[PDB]
């Protein structure tokens, strides 16, 4: 009569005791992937999910990823675009200690069943479901440093809200996603070499060089307004593009599209407009296109539509 | 007898300062307006030797008028905004105002923003809350002024405390005053400096690069500021490079990526034993600004903590 | 080579001569239906637009229809449930005066005849289109008095951003609406009557009297919170519902719905929940739903739809 | 010594009141609390003289404890604590607290809703700041504060002016404070007062009927407030009635639906003219507490409108 949802640990809080309410909505299995905090998430922890999930798709009716709040959004991300799987993944995590008054982590944790075992949330990617609302994996962000209510889906906002156990589903991404992207992970044990760059007053070139020096394959840059680049590292990065590193235009301003045909000529310089992609999401959709092409052009191509 | 406002401009135009006040008319019903061009550089090329310039500019002509108008882009404003709110000993208001579209587009924000601008500098009320951006009728405080959004003609806010008062009609209702010190209740002097202490910022991501970071070190960096992940937090290489610079006297200051909310003390960083910094509700390049300034006075952790505590 | 496109106009501000850039992206006829400040728009109105729209849909290629901002979003909605024409139709209108410095009119009508343009926008409902944003009918609301971005889709976010003259749409309205909807308005000159009363502390019962005692047949209540109505308030409705006046439970509070299995027993009362509906377009609705039932059951699964 | 706080509970329980405090052990880390049960309504139910009966206990009560903490429904909490804001005289803080979720849900948010607000109520700095709401670790003022979504724990917002401090690790960065008057600057004075003059509160909308206007006018009440569209206008036939019970001495404030920003004088609506009052930023409930206060004072508009500037 109960869906079969697995959930996969990345770090700490078993629990089928610890919610016992869980019962009456699922049957839960539970399985430590790796213990980490998440500001140590890496590509490896990442490759190993999106493998886990690939191979155990027919195993389960649906699975809950419990993971740091930190890093959150870039691993849902990466799951988006790399799971082959058509069965609702979610991932969840707590900003209060699990002993802490008033945790969030218990009911958290039970939206997060809830979302996974709703047949209605297939097909609409990686979801993120945190204070009561179902997120999109390439839209959903952290806002607040410290708030139960951090997690927003900044520029096209959450697929759903969730009230007494129950979905009203009003949206789904339009952005491909999973089993509609070619990124296929399968076979991979390395991930390309992105780094990210700070812009703002008086900005040094050295991070950028460090990059360029160090053969990277591609450099983010967080850019300032509507991705503008401080002079230093703008010559650097010009440079960077005509050697082999690709490089993606995002911003450190939270909302909004860095955009094409604005301050920058982008195909002058061989360079990507990351859109609405902030730059640890740029990275993510770098990281990819680069298993598939160093092209800036075809580059872009995959910014516009993934 | 209308106030006597100057306009500094620091690049293009937003309605090149004379074609400016010739462009917005209206101005003379409000004040007596004079333009001085003081560089001409998108912000997105803001830097040290701008904001001396500016600095001692206003404290050395604060006599000479009873308010300023800074025009300026909207890319780094809210890091001028903020040097400024530490600097400036002039207790005139002075105001930052920019534009989100070009002047020549359809609709173009800059016309009424300068004129907002100008009702601002010109109200007596503005005195003594500090240096103030003035963008889409809404008067916000330099600490925590930034802009949200990358096109939005009202990217303008304070995302932590709100603004101090919104602009209906030519008049400000005031209702709020920042309570961090500011202006000539710092001990910031910048009118013998030449320079500023060398102050970059590295970001915090999954599988986050220690290059950026060893390549302030190895420059010999005054500071780093840390864009952290969620409260602050910090990759493992990250965290290394930036324990053993602290442990050199480099100065490092954990802020956040996160938009909103303080980089707290007392949560997963044990500052005191790595000789770390917690910004506050200071974002990474606010946090820049105000540890440059720190480092002008002292090297010692525990008191630029407590500059970051009071400023 | 260029759209059909026929500005609807409802109040003041000719204007291809008064934004001549226009010319450049559609070929734009006018027509004036009424001159009225929204803060008096009425029924007959929004009958007449349908009619029209309904009327003229094979003789343009899209509707923009400019309105005041005061009342934009419940003639917005009740297009959105009413127009059967399967081509865009845009509201747009304007904050600040058209003399006044830095008016928002010239490029909101720009960017209401790009999206009315765009073939992209086709099948997304009734859309408002302010501050370069693309709204959907439904969600779409007036957040503060005097801000030229006041209008935001505040449950379920934008339908798209438009940058230099180009959407990228990434999502759309899962609610029926215009051609799925039941509500076929071609033949009426009158609307069922629907009041609003509003709820706070030691509220009179003497609003809600007055439209029992003039046969409404309905009252949409603006409730505290999560749609809670102070006591003298309760007992007027719990009565009103039982002798032929639908009652529909809203929120003053201006985001988040109005849900089931809260406080209320709507089914003991004979109430409808609104869900996100604030209570003026919960207003809509009912008026629409009236015109096909009158059992609180059959309205509630309506509220459910649409 | 840690301080003497007082919880006046209004309802049910949050984590009646000795219950509560069981619930909450870590709240003696603290302070020394002690609660009453004042009444036990759900706040839908809120009402004139739970108002009365709360402002003259904390007047009444003020030297027999350090702070007060209201437990409070989340519903109406916005009005009582503006009605609080300005007829308490006693300044210590007083500190109203609710949740969003019932105390037996998991991730129950009362417990720790109940903890910020003792330890806001137990901050020194936290007086002569007026009265004051916290939830989700923030802490806002009783004026501009508002609930603004139905179901969500992070509902309570200052939404035109931003809270006063956030609250980390049982301690308070105040950074704003509320520039109207308030409390013992307000010329309210409750004490010998049974009732309050009646204000109703009607909604505009496209084709509003005007029989609820009528309706309160016929009734003989002392004011209404419209909750106006867009910047506080008013549909034809309720303008029409309006205008009119203005005639014959009903004070009339506009206020607003929409659920930022002020509803301003000067503007569509010729207030001088009709004998009506702008609220400014003051939403229809809000405004109705204002005035009524205003008219325990005045029944002059002109007057009135100087009470809605000035409080
Ligand atoms: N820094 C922690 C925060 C949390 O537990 O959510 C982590 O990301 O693992
Ligand atoms: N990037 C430009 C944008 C503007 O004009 O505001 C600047 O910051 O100078
Ligand atoms: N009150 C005016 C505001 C505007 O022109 O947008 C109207 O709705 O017609
Ligand atoms: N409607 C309830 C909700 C709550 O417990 O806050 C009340 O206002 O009393």
């Known amino acids: 009569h109960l869906p079969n949802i697995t959930i996969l640990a990345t770090g700490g ?17 539970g399985e430590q992937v790796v213990n980490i905090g998440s500001q140590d998430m890496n590509d490896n922890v ?6 886990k999930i690939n191979t155990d798709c027919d195993k389960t009716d649906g699975f809950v990823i419990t993971h ?17 799987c058509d069965k609702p993944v979610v991932m969840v995590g707590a900003m ?4 802490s008054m008033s945790a969030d982590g218990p009911f958290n944790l039970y939206n997060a069943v809830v979302t996974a075992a709703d047949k209605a949330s297939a097909n609409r990617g990686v979801l993120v479901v945190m204070n009561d609302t179902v997120l999109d994996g390439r839209d959903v962000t952290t806002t607040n440093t410290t708030d139960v209510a951090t997690f927003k889906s900044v520029n096209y906002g959450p697929l759903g809200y969730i009230h007494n156990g129950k979905i009203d589903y009003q949206r789904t991404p339009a952005r491909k996603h999973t089993s509609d992207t070619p990124f296929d992970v399968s076979k991979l044990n390395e991930l390309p070499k992105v780094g990210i760059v700070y812009n703002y007053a008086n900005a040094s070139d050295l991070p950028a060089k460090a990059l360029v020096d160090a053969g990277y394959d591609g450099i983010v840059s967080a850019g300032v307004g509507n ?3 401080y002079k230093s590292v703008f010559d650097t990065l010009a440079t960077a593009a005509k050697t082999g590193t690709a490089v993606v235009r995002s911003s450190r301003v939270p909302t909004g599209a860095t955009t094409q045909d604005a301050e920058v000529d982008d195909a002058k310089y061989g360079f990507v407009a990351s859109g609405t992609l902030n730059p640890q999401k740029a990275r993510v959709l770098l990281q ?11 580059i872009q191509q995959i910014f516009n539509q993934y």
């Open 288 to 298: 990819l296109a680069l298993t598939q092409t160093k092209d800036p052009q075809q």
């Open 13 to 29: 809080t078993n629990l089928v005791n610890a919610v016992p309410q869980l019962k009456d909505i699922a049957n839960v299995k």
């Open 96 to 99: 209060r200690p699990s002993t």
């Open 46 to 51: 990442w490759l190993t999910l999106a493998k």
């Open 68 to 84: 740091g709040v930190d890093t959150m959004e870039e691993t849902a991300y990466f799951l988006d675009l790399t799971v082959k």
């Open 227 to 229: 991705g503008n680049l």
